[PDB]
Amino acid sequence: VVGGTEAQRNSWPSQISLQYRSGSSWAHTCGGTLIRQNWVMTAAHCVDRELTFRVVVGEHNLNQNNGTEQYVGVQKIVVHPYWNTDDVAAGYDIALLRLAQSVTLNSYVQLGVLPRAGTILANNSPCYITGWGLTRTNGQLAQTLQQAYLPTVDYAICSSSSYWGSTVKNSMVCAGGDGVRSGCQGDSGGPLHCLVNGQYAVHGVTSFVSRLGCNVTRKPTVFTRVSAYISWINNVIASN
Ligand SMILES: [Ca+2]
């Protein structure tokens, strides 16, 4: 997250760190949202590589013991069947990870609330992106979870010529674009939390940013629209 502020430890308890084994160690690669005690919603592109993954819930500082972490293997990965790694702009950048064990819920580990199917937010709706991704374009990962206020940019504006044009689809949510705050590499897969009827819900799964850089004016961060996938999500959970 570029131009973020450090999140309070108990702010975003559905945020997870998706990590892959790297030698004798584990490296953060993407975010995710805990949606059941044994399921995590993330981006499909986060799990294209044939790597060994684990999920960390209750995480705050990647590099220090917080006293609140639970570590769990990924047992099954279900990518959306229409995802095509060659074509992020086509959409479908979403995957569900079934965890090897159910995690324990507490102040630091909670299920992410999802929107009702089909819900579209009005332009400029209040949302926060959270994650441990790069804090600058071509920078380094955050040590502590970051949040940035990123108001939505509705489809009509987001798919206009000076914004994303044809690259953005109605199956996506755009947010931000102010040239200062943005998602960045390593936030992919994580939540965009939007306030609706008094309650934050996870409306987006971070998907992509401009090839030109993370915080680019009129190139808001782009998220898979969760509310476009509620049936798919329910179907996968029910059959696994
Ligand atoms: Ca930690």
Side-chain angles (χ1 to χ4, degrees), residues 59 61 64 66 69:
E59 179 59 291
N61 186 322
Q64 85 185 209
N66 283 294
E69 303 92 329

mmCIF file of all heavy atoms in Angstrom, residues 59 61 64 66 69, ligand 1:
data_model
loop_
_atom_site.group_PDB
_atom_site.id
_atom_site.type_symbol
_atom_site.label_atom_id
_atom_site.label_comp_id
_atom_site.label_asym_id
_atom_site.label_seq_id
_atom_site.Cartn_x
_atom_site.Cartn_y
_atom_site.Cartn_z
ATOM 1 N N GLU A 59 -2.192 -11.914 11.812
ATOM 2 C CA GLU A 59 -0.862 -11.353 11.590
ATOM 3 C C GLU A 59 -0.910 -9.813 11.601
ATOM 4 O O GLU A 59 -1.868 -9.220 11.137
ATOM 5 C CB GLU A 59 -0.271 -11.901 10.271
ATOM 6 C CG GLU A 59 1.121 -11.360 9.899
ATOM 7 C CD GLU A 59 2.173 -11.656 10.950
ATOM 8 O OE1 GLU A 59 2.116 -11.092 12.050
ATOM 9 O OE2 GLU A 59 3.068 -12.475 10.678
ATOM 10 N N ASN A 61 2.703 -7.734 12.146
ATOM 11 C CA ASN A 61 4.075 -7.403 11.749
ATOM 12 C C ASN A 61 4.678 -8.665 11.143
ATOM 13 O O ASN A 61 4.768 -9.704 11.843
ATOM 14 C CB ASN A 61 4.863 -6.932 12.978
ATOM 15 C CG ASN A 61 6.258 -6.429 12.604
ATOM 16 O OD1 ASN A 61 6.914 -7.003 11.714
ATOM 17 N ND2 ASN A 61 6.729 -5.389 13.295
ATOM 18 N N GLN A 64 8.096 -9.788 13.047
ATOM 19 C CA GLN A 64 8.199 -9.981 14.496
ATOM 20 C C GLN A 64 7.009 -10.778 15.063
ATOM 21 O O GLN A 64 5.914 -10.770 14.497
ATOM 22 C CB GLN A 64 8.418 -8.640 15.209
ATOM 23 C CG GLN A 64 7.197 -7.835 15.529
ATOM 24 C CD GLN A 64 7.542 -6.456 16.132
ATOM 25 O OE1 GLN A 64 6.769 -5.898 16.923
ATOM 26 N NE2 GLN A 64 8.697 -5.898 15.739
ATOM 27 N N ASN A 66 3.945 -11.408 17.101
ATOM 28 C CA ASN A 66 2.858 -10.551 17.576
ATOM 29 C C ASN A 66 2.109 -11.206 18.707
ATOM 30 O O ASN A 66 1.343 -10.554 19.435
ATOM 31 C CB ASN A 66 1.902 -10.258 16.409
ATOM 32 C CG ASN A 66 2.465 -9.224 15.468
ATOM 33 O OD1 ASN A 66 2.618 -8.077 15.845
ATOM 34 N ND2 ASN A 66 2.797 -9.626 14.262
ATOM 35 N N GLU A 69 -0.603 -14.814 16.042
ATOM 36 C CA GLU A 69 -0.648 -15.484 14.696
ATOM 37 C C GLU A 69 -1.098 -16.969 14.819
ATOM 38 O O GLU A 69 -0.788 -17.660 15.849
ATOM 39 C CB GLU A 69 0.738 -15.473 14.053
ATOM 40 C CG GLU A 69 1.389 -14.061 13.875
ATOM 41 C CD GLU A 69 2.285 -13.643 15.051
ATOM 42 O OE1 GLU A 69 2.034 -14.049 16.220
ATOM 43 O OE2 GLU A 69 3.264 -12.854 14.827
HETATM 44 CA CA CA B 1 4.069 -11.385 13.193
#
